Design a protein around this ligand. Structure first.
Ligand SMILES: CNC(=O)CN1C[C@@H](C(=O)Nc2cncc3cc(F)ccc23)c2cc(Cl)ccc2C1=O
Ligand SMILES: [Cl-]
Lengths: 297, 305
């Protein structure tokens, strides 16, 4: 028993973290095979600035060893530094683009040195509520499936509200953001409804049933209520995805939606669910099934 | 900016996780140098668990009865000894992935990262605290025994906890890496219960200082308090007594934010009386006690917003 915000073991990613310095800027890079991937703003019209640069301008440090840059190219907002040495610690990996509501682990780094690991979710407004300081740029987001690391996020910047913005490993930003100091703001955020429901199922599995009721709701009536509390619309796909948890607990998804409706209109009344006084939306249905089963990496 | 519950990178610990099997029991072991450390209850049956005589069970064992697996490689056990509630299996290979390490015993209120494992395979990492009642509110299932708690300050791993059991309330009990339990617990399936738990006051105060550093001051008031009057109010909400040691420890955060410890204590007193009134502090509707003063100084900026 117990329900914690759990991150993937970071070891396979730690073996890829490097420090990249270009002039006065120092940030983190991801060394996979003979390529170091890092935010293109380390050079700060990016192609016009990049064309002036030579290979020896980029200093890459892997632990106490200096890597030799033998080539460089730009892909969207990511810089790809070709190095002379293949990373012997390169794990089996894929570059994947995640959707909002999906969760991932973040290995926060400073000077190519991992300092912490935390779990978080891609918000519906495409920002992440991370924990980053100056020097964190180039820190990466990932998930693990058996022995394969799926890289999904590279940190680029902080917004005025304290939230974070970044790209997939192919350099495409998540959200309507650009990589420069300009007037940018996160859009109004919403709650990830399918994740709150999964977390209510996790509470039932851990013996927390005070919020259950005899009632049910139609999907349309639930969405009419949820739209009023800035909750993301619940689709039939979300309902199908919650199927296994529904069969395990004996509580139909629309039956759990009727509990969520009552929680939204009436609150917790001095009570908590899994030690929380707020409705938690940073655990996906798969995260709940994985943590309430025992899957290893 | 931002304030997350952050765990240490688990890589140096993952390279030490092994699977230990003795008869029908399978749990996790920690392989450091040529020794594998694991809960001594791996030698037990579920029957034995009521009143196990470990010395009697261990003397009946030979080296080849203990199967140790590191990945897909079988380690050979060449010796065994018991130290308190930990079994130490001497093996014929030193772990090449052994990091710089120490065995440290922590005090309640201290935090640490947990690498949860099943069958010598790490599955997840989370941050938690040693509760005042010596239990940990972990996330463990059957097969997690032998999972370890650690801190990685600088490049040295300080092992502080080894998981041994789950109490009836769902909380967890374990030992330091020398086999001494935290709390009045025994590795017996006897009727044991966690004592009434309390809130780690010095940690809640540190987290209020972290909120001030991140630009939030809604909860501050114009009042101060004596340490004794704060403790008289705090005990009424099941908060741990705040000692002069805690006040001294909060010194650097007080100097950084310009808010005296007993002034922050007055804000805490007020928060306990009023509640949050629909407001949050660092994204939380409850008062957080699983961040130490040291964690706050480590994670938060040196420049207050
Ligand atoms: C809740 N456990 C039980 O009813 C059976 N039980 C087995 C074992 C034990 O607690 N293991 C487990 C550890 N952590 C999480 C566990 C989650 C589980 F769902 C099951 C087992 C877990 C044990 C070890 C010792 Cl040293 C003393 C007593 C016991 C004991 O009582
Ligand atoms: Cl300590």
């Amino acid at each position: 028993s117990g329900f914690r915000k759990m991150a993937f073991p970071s070891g396979k990613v730690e073996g890829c973290m490097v420090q990249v310095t270009c002039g006065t800027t120092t940030l983190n890079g991801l060394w996979l095979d003979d390529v170091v991937y890092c935010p293109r703003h380390v050079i700060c019209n990016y192609e016009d600035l990049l064309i002036r640069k030579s290979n020896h301008n980029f200093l890459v440090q892997a632990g106490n060893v200096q890597l030799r840059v033998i080539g460089h190219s730009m892909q969207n907002c990511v810089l790809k530094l070709k190095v002379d040495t293949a990373n012997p610690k390169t794990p089996k990996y894929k570059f994947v683009r995640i959707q909002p509501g999906q969760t991932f682990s973040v290995l926060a780094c400073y000077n190519g040195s991992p300092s912490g690991v935390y779990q978080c979710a891609m918000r519906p407004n495409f920002t992440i509520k991370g924990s980053f300081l100056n020097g964190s740029c180039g820190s990466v987001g990932f998930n693990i499936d058996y022995d394969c690391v799926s890289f999904c996020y590279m940190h680029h910047m902080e917004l005025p509200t304290g939230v974070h913005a970044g790209t997939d490993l192919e350099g495409n930003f998540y959200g309507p953001f650009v990589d420069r100091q300009t007037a940018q703001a996160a859009g109004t955020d919403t709650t990830i409804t399918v994740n709150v429901l999964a977390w209510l199922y996790a509470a039932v599995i851990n013996g927390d049933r005070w919020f259950l009721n005899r009632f049910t709701t139609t999907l349309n009536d639930f969405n009419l209520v949820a739209m009023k509390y800035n909750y993301e619309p619940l689709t039939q796909d979300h309902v199908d995805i919650l199927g296994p948890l529904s069969a395990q607990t004996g509580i139909a998804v629309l039956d759990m939606c009727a509990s969520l409706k009552e929680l939204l209109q009436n609150g917790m009344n001095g009570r908590t669910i899994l030690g929380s006084a707020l409705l938690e939306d940073e655990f996906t249905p798969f995260d709940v099934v994985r943590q309430c089963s025992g899957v290893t990496f």
